[PDB]
Amino acid sequence: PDLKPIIGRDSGRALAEVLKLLKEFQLKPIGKKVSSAVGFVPDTGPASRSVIRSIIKSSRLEEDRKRYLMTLLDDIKGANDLAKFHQMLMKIIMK
Amino acid sequence: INRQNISISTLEGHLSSIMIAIPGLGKD
Amino acid sequence: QINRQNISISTLEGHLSSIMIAIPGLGKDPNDPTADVELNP
Amino acid sequence: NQILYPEVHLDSPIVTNKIVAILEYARVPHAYSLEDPTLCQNIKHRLKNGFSNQMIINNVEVGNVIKSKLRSYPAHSHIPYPNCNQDLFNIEDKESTRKIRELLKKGNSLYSKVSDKVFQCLRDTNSRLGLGSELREDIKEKIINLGVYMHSSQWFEPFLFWFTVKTEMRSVIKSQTHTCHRRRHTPVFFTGSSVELLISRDLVAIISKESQHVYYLTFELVLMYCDVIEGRLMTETAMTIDARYAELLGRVRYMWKLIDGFFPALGNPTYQIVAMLEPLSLAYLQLRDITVELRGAFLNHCFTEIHDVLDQNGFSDEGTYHELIEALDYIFITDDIHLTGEIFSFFRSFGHPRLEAVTAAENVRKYMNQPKVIVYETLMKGHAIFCGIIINGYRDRHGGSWPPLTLPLHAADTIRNAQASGEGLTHEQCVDNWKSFAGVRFGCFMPLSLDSDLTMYLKDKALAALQREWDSVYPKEFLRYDPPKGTGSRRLVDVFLNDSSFDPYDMIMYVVSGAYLHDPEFNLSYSLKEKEIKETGRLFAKMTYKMRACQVIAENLISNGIGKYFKDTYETVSAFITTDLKKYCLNWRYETISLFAQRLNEIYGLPSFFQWLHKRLETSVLYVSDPHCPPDLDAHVPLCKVPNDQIFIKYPMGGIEGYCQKLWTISTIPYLYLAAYESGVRIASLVQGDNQTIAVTKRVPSTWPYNLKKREAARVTRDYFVILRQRLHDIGHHLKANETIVSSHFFVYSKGIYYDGLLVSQSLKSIARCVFWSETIVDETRAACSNIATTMAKSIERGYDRYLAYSLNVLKVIQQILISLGFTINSTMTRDVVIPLLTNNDLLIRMALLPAPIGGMNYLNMSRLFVRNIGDPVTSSIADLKRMILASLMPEETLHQVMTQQPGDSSFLDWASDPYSANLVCVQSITRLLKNITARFVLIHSPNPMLKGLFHDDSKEEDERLAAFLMDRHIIVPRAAHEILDHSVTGARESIAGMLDTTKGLIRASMRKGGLTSRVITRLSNYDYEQFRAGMVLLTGRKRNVLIDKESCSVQLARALRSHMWARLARGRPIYGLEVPDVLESMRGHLIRRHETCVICECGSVNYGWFFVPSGCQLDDISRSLRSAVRIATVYSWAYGDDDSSWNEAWLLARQRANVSLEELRVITPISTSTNTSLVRVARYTTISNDNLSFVISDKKVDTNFIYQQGMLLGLGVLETLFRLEKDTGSSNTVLHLHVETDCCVIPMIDHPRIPSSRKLELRAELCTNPLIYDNAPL
Ligand SMILES: Cn1nc(C(F)(F)F)cc1C(=O)Nc1ccc(S(=O)(=O)N2CCCCC2)cc1
Ligand SMILES: [Zn+2]
Ligand SMILES: [Zn+2]
Questions:
Q1: Pocket of ligand 1 (CB under 6 A)
Q2: Cβ pair D357, D646 in contact under 8 A
Q3: Are D385 and D425 in contact (CB under 8 A)?
Q4: What gap in Å lies between CA D359 and CA D535, rounded to an integer?
Q5: DSSP per-residue codes, D598-631
Q6: Which residues of D1142-1152 are buried (b: 16+ CB within 10 A; e: fewer)?
Q7: Does residue D558 sit within a domain?
Q8: How far apart are CA D927 and CA C35, in angstroms?
Q9: CATH number (domain holding residue A77)
Q10: Is A14 within a domain?
Q11: Other CB atoms closer than 10 Å to residue D560's CB: what's the count?
Q12: Whose CA is nearest to atom 12 of ligand 1?
């Protein structure tokens, strides 16, 4: 809004969070494509790759199919394609 | 008065949403 | 004609009342030692 | 000062400054890096000065011994804690444990002789209950060879080593710290087979022969290693002899071997990975979710942190991280649901980190010095919900009215007319027009609960030193100057029971008047907290006396007053959110709490009272003080001139955890309710322990799939979470997404992990704590063998096997007895008991198999395996003994020795305060006796106005006289005497003296001041010696009671036992109302399968509990108002009964309790017709019909003779121990019959309406009007 007043504990003791235009230190928005406490969205990072691997491992499919999905994961690169494979696997698991 | 009413109600409209800035040290 | 602005003045006063209770200072006795002294002596 | 043995278990933190100080004064080289070099610089400068005392001299001599022995080893290297963990966990010596090895070998050869009969006696009980005719051939082998399993374990030799070292250092410390003899011999190394020991009084030096490594340890490290290994050995044995943990054993063993391999490389930061097994055990349970979008949500954060810790530590390679992640996957990924909370039990068995003060002060300074920007609109929208909650909480309980309540100023029409009409208002109106509550001023309508009890003040707390002497905690060694001496006391009870003028209103006015802001003595200090697996973790705060008193007073006010207002087709479906409240009290500024403290100021009528915390903190300095980390100060300075550095936190803003808990808890609900209204979902919060859960709930159509129902119930809370996060961030709180869980199935609490109606309990948390010596002040075999049997019975209810837990208890008792007889530091164990007992093998196992209510040392009887409370200890122990004699575990003459043993010497008050006690010679606890003596003495000698006029030295004689008058009649009733005496003013004194928890320091002070005589010291310094002598006499005595046989019922046996035991106070008069038949002897059983006809039913019995279970794959998922101490008088007058004449005496005692007349008393008492399931998984399927069991003795208008719930608990127990190893409940539906027989158990009694009091009633000269003592002005 760029228009929000600010009153501090004292007159001149508000110079800390006045420059953070840039008035309040907001919070990072929980987006549908950013990993947060709600929902899973995989990045390119090894953390996310290992999490998808753990989902394949702890899923309740058959062993050969689990290994085949692992092989499919071995040759995937890029956050976008990784997210597509994640959606595919989530669709497959409940089938 | 017909104008002063809104000219003073806008003050309350703007004051009903302010930001309190708490410092880091209790004495400074 | 007048009560419609008296309500606004009272709303502003009630905002400034509870806005200087949650901010220490800003007056001579601006804090809240304004309760009934005690039920028992 | 010799009745105090050194500590046996770990109770303090491991401070690296401690070891650094010891080694730097002993002049030994050491590879110990310190964050702050101030301690080393201080010690160095002090040595250059020339300061030295006896401790310095002793450490110098020990260091000389170490440095002279280190010459034989050319390439020695100090391996520091925790890098030495992998070695010192698997250390083993063969020429140092030469004694304890033989001891435990003998203790195992005794069990090898008793074990076949133990198994036979358990198989008898099983077959009797009706679980077949033969135990599992695996269970038989485990029970019989349970000693060989415990001896062929990988932790046995480390256990022997870390027990030998522990007991040797304990003996050294005990024999040395006593001022008897001062001439000391230097300690020399003990060259063993593979290691070389030097057990000094302060530090232990262990050199490794082949490896050349050198380790220096302290008493805390030795205690921690002994605890860790005694836990690992017990848990590995309990998972080896058991079959349900056949899969868990491999995972836990791999976890041990995998995280042990990081200690040599990673070091101290390895506990940041060890402390990641509590969140991971939930992140890996989320992978079974039903809304696939949530799977991995928490696991991503867990793995991100596990990667960041490795990167910051230095293991930047990717191979190490990948192998670690694969290992953790293998460990945690599993199928069974009930074995997912088990890895929780094991994450405390890697030891505790070594911590300092700087790294725990900076972590809290970072959070307490931080600006914030709150939002006024949402602050007031929450304050409106607060005012609305108060409005509704007072309009209820008062018939919909606001007599003293709010008086708005410019309120809206609906909210102004709600007051006039005297009706409530929901969250909708408040959040809609919160502008109406923008200036509401309450008026005092809440009294001040003043003299409820003394809990808050009496509960042991520490006090900080007065601000003028804030550095008296640091001894003169580690400081660069002479610190000021410490005048004031250092305990809440020591400063409270010496308060010549105490007044809660004086304290409240000390806050109201505002002298707490000018008090030149206020001081707040931080202290590191022991047994935490986080290097920063937590601290606990200590503040001065007056301020601590005002704090506890404020918390009691806010918990007794409005704090109680906040307690509370289409189906409902609820998800769960769980977030931990650590580091959540430092984000509580004054601005966000003043609007809620002000309404409470105006409710209780205490101007500017309820916001004392921030007004005091915002102008004070708090340092973190431990005796070994001093500040760097060349000369003494006040606490206001110290800079903002290592240990100081100048002028904080946030709160302090624990203080104002009720205030924060009631001021945090308005924002939950606002965020719930903004989404249209009904929530319910629960703060249980250290993490709060919220059960968001929504109504959904019934004719829906379970999958879609749970998916929508998770979507609604995924929406609610962001709203709540925005609200908390606008009021100033960060609801982090890393430390939080959202899940549609589970939530953590303090009784396990609730998972969709189940409960994944952790059974191996108490087996890891059934260590040898129990927590006490003097090593006592009775308390040890009671703590050994009080934890197996908890593992049994959390999921362990009954028979294997019983055998483990028997074995651990048999070797605890031997350790206390021939491997103890006690000095009063003489050859007249040590030699005969250790020589006679049969007697030594008889004393360890004989139950404790009879005279033995076995505290776990075969009925405590199944039911929660046994009926009568003395009639259940005799049934247990009969079972043992029948199964030929003990000879027949033991029953005669029991029934003709030597009666002890106890008075009437002891029989009235312990009513099930067939009196025994020298059985009580030395700790309990010292507590009940010192508490009584210090409460009699106290000028405190709160409890004055209550503790006069004649109180003991008055108690004994009242007990004699109550018990002594023509028919004795110990239970009723106990109830009356407990509720009287003689039970109030004992309750206060028990609440006054005396510490080792307090008993030391009492002995220094002469609290108890040297005669009592000599009487209680050789107690356990008398226990063993009395047991020897009991088991050797050769008498016979010709009227005793195996066939006479256990009830008759217990009656005869009590009569013969104290006829000196009975003279033949019947004791009545104690004996209740034993459940396991009285109840037989049978299991009806698909096609068969019952046999014990058709044999004639028609009284039996009927349990049913169907077949289906499960076990995975599916003038009197606002009562007061007048209630004490009421329950007493009902326990006395209805009497023609003795109603006068009942009224007399109830009058001494509370002020009321006989007529009001008779009309208030409820005259009666007489004169006197969250633990298992197969109780959901179970169906119970109580109809056939309704047959009791005449089934008249009385209570159930046997506790009716026993015949149901004992049925659920057998059903659970049947389906314990099955995944499904079978193919055919099963039924269970639980016939009972109490024929000969019926006491042939004469129904006395009441007994005439055959003693004159003498009471206190006048009932004292102390208001703490039951009130004497109700109306
Ligand atoms: C502001 N807030 N929002 C939420 C929500 F909704 F997100 F869960 C929770 C809180 C909140 O925790 N208040 C609060 C409650 C108790 C304490 S404590 O000091 O007594 N404590 C210390 C740690 C162990 C337990 C006891 C400190 C702050
Ligand atoms: Zn019987
Ligand atoms: Zn039957």
A1: D 579, 581-582, 584-585, 657-658, 661, 664-665, 668, 672, 690, 692, 728, 733, 735
A2: yes
A3: no
A4: 8
A5: HHHHHHHT-TT-TTHHHHHHTT-EEEE--TT---
A6: bbebbbebbbb
A7: yes
A8: 50
A9: 1.10.8.10
A10: no
A11: 15
A12: D581
Query: Is residue D551 in some structural domain?
Result: yes
Pocket test for ligand 1, best of D364, D534, D664, D690 (most atoms within 8 A of CB): D664
Owning domain of residue D428: 376-432
Q: Coil, strand, or helix at residue D677? A: helix
- The angle at the Cα of D1250, spanning D1246 to D1255, to the nearest 5 degrees, equals 115
Q: Is the CB of A7 inside 8 Å of chain C's CB atoms?
A: yes
If you write DSSP's letter for every residue of D791-817 in order, what string do you get?
A: HHHHHHHHT--HHHHHHHHHHHHHHHH
Sheet with D621-624: strands ordered across: D539-543, D524-528, D621-624, D648-650
A15 assigned to some structural domain: no
Reply yes or no: is the peptide bond before residue D82 cis, omega within 30 of 0: yes
Nearest CA-CA partner of D350 in D276, D400, D403: D276
Side chain identity at residue D316, one-letter code: S
Looking at CA atoms only, how far is residue A27 from chain D in angstroms? 7
Length of chain B equals 28
- Six-digit token pair at D499? 């308060």
Residue D1 lies in a domain: no
Query: Other CB atoms closer than 10 Å to residue D639's CB: what's the count?
Result: 19
Residue span of the structural domain in which A52 resides: 46-93
Tokens linked to D881 = 């003994």
Laid out side by side, the sheet with D1086-1088 consists of: D1086-1088, D1230-1235, D1104-1109, D1183-1185
CA pair distance D377, D435, nearest whole angstrom:
10
Single out the residue of D869, D854, D964 nearest to residue D909, CA to CA.
D964
Which contacts of D203-209 are long-range, i.e. CB under 8 A and separated by 24 or more positions? D203/D19, D203/D22, D203/D23, D203/D26, D203/D59, D203/D62, D204/D165, D204/D169, D205/D62, D205/D66, D206/D88, D206/D91, D207/D69, D207/D70, D207/D73, D207/D76, D208/D87, D208/D91
The C-alpha of B11 sits at a distance from chain D's nearest C-alpha, in angstroms, of 15
How far is Cα D1021 from Cα D1044, in angstroms, rounded to an integer? 38
Rg over CA atoms, chain C: 15
- Into how many domains does chain C fold? 1
- Final residue of a structural domain among D636, D668, D700: D668
**Residue D350 domain-assigned?**
no
Distance of CA D1258 to the CA centre of its chain: 41
D930 contacts D777 by C-beta, under 8 angstroms: yes
* Residue D337: both structure tokens together: 């649901």
- Verify that D414 and D520 share a domain, yes or no: no
Residue D717 burial (CB < 10 Å; 0-12/13-18/19+)? buried
For residue D477, the one-letter residue type is E
Q: CB count, 10 Å around CB of D892? A: 11
Are the CB atoms for D247 and D238 separated by under 8 Å?
no
Which residue, D628, D650, D668, sits at the end of a domain? Answer: D668
In angstroms, rounded to a whole number, what is the distance separating the alpha carbons of residues D433 and D414?
10
Q: How was it solved?
A: cryo-EM
Residues in chain C that come right before a backbone break, where C and next N are over 2.5 Å apart: none
Instruction: Please report where in the chains the tokens 């009720």 appear, as a residue.
Output: D662
Cα B16 to averaged position of ligand 1 atoms, centre (Å)? 28
Q: Which residues of D268-288 are buried (b: 16+ CB within 10 A; e: fewer)?
A: bbbbbbbbbbebbbbbbbbbb
Residue A55 is assigned to a structural domain of this protein? yes
Please check whether residues D411 and D364 belong to one and the same domain: no
CA distance D955 to D939: 11
User: Of the candidates D662, D660, D650, which has an alpha carbon nearest to the alpha carbon of residue D364?
Assistant: D650
Three-class SS state of D76: coil
Number of Cβ atoms within 10 Å of the Cβ of D229: 25
D421 with D456, same domain?
A: no
Q: Which two tokens stand for residue D1152?
A: 């001494």
